[PDB]
């Protein structure tokens, strides 16, 4: 939970550039599915500590980033490798499904 960076429009670009592998959760307090999958991510940031950074962008509070990265709706997860977008998972999902998506995109 406190392993999860909260990005702002302002902070975004620097952060993703700044650490190798990072997973961003585009979310909002009104989006139920985003609320739903949030504790999954909590666990992921623990379970993947040291291999993968996990971050949230609240879009109500950071209106500009989503269009910038072609986020058409939430939830939507972005995996960046080396400061660049690598894979993208749209819609709600189970830990299992998320874990696969992660594994199948690291090494």
SSE arrangement:
Blueprint: E1 4-7, H1 9-18, E2 21-27, H2 32-47, E3 53-58, H3 65-68, E4 76-81, E5 84-90, H4 95-103
Parallel strand pairs: 1-3, 2-3
Antiparallel strand pairs: 2-4, 4-5
Function: Participates in various redox reactions through the reversible oxidation of its active center dithiol to a disulfide and catalyzes dithiol-disulfide exchange reactions.
GO biological process, one term: cell redox homeostasis
Family: Belongs to the thioredoxin family.
Tell me about this structure:
This protein is an alpha/beta fold and 107 residues long. It has a single domain, classed as Glutaredoxin (3-Layer(aba) Sandwich), CATH 3.40.30. It is 36% helix and 28% strand. The protein is built from 4 helices and 5 strands. It has helices at residues 9-18, 32-47, 65-68, 95-103, and strands spanning 4-7, 21-27, 53-58, 76-81, 84-90. A 5-stranded mixed β-sheet has the order 1-3-2-4-5, sandwiched between helices. A hairpin with a 2-residue loop joins strand 4 (76-81) and strand 5. The longest helix has 16 residues, at 32-47. Disulfide bonds join 31-34.
């Amino acid at each position: 939970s406190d392993k999860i960076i909260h990005l702002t429009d302002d902070s975004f670009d620097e952060v993703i550039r700044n650490n190798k592998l990072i997973l961003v959760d585009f979310w909002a307090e009104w989006c139920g599915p985003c609320k739903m999958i949030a504790p999954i991510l909590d666990e992921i940031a623990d379970e993947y500590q040291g291999k993968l950074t996990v971050a949230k962008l609240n879009i109500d509070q950071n209106p500009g980033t989503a269009p910038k990265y072609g986020i058409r709706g939430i939830p939507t997860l972005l995996l960046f490798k080396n400061g660049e977008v690598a894979a993208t998972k749209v819609g709600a999902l189970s830990k299992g499904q998320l874990k696969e998506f992660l594994d199948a995109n690291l090494a």
